[PDB]
Amino acid sequence: TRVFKKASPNGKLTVYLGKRDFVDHIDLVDPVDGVVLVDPEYLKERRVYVTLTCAFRYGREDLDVLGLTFRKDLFVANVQSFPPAPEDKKPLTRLQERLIKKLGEHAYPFTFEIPPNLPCSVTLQPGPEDTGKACGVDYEVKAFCAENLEEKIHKRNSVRLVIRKVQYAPERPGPQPTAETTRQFLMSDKPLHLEASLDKEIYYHGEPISVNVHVTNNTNKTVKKIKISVRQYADICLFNTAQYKCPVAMEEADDTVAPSSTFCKVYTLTPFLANNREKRGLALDGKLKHEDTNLASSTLLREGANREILGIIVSYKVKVKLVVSRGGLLGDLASSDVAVELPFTLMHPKPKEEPPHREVPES
């Protein structure tokens, strides 16, 4: 078993951690455990502080300054390790005690406990002319020593490590989402029936998506085109709710439906970033520094709690549209198209032992 560590530019401080990814089971989150190495002989501050922060760093448009990013902290909790506070009595994990044994008596443990109902690690896809840091939600841990909390911090007297908060697809699937629509017109009372259904509400990244569609045309018009698409629904809550959508892949079918006739078929779509590189602002999963990641996996909220979650909430939908011939008494004034939306959920399966790593075929 190997672990991660990093040292201050001075070299007097070093922190040790068990991993970088922390699993949230929705209801609870895995406790973040670690041990820091200290050298009290050289330090006259006599106080050591560590902090885990949830901040939304973002770029600024109006300011003409290049590289500067604004950041709004969302959740900040700090715990002091040295000197050992008698009140902060906590048990040590199986690995943590081994680490204390190895390092000796000059290393102190620490532990944060993230409250639930917090945003996941999400990154926005930067534009072609972007040279600053990443935009999105990202955690980080900062460790430092100072005489007081309000004391000015030195660049040499602190460290910064990034961690990710991800979810996994639940083991048990639910019912199959199926949606139907019915449209009526004015010239005749014959209704227009439409049915749409997917295979299963849970898919994996890169797997094909197959939908079943059935059409019951009863009017005197003819169907010209059928539009099938899936779009990315992104919810952001920084100061006010902002709603916007972006398609990932579109397919057009040249099927025509005669009046008073039916039809049925199945089509397939596949989402991937290769053809969507230029689409600015797309939501992507957690990034460490620049590693190329997949599309942002779907986020599972706290059931039907109807909470106003901060940060980014991501979802996906399936859009099916019908093109209907125009003309007649209304001419080209009416809107006779028919549409339907199908939601679905997409994550990663539970890893067995291996955590995801950083761009295995390094160049």
């Binding site: 078993t1 190997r2 672990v3 991660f4 560590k5 990093k6 040790y16 690995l95 081994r98 680490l99 190895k102």
Partner: peptide
């Protein structure tokens, strides 16, 4: 940078 280490047991 990000370096690695282990606990030899």
């Amino acid at each position: 940078e990000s370096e690695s280490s282990s606990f030899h047991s």
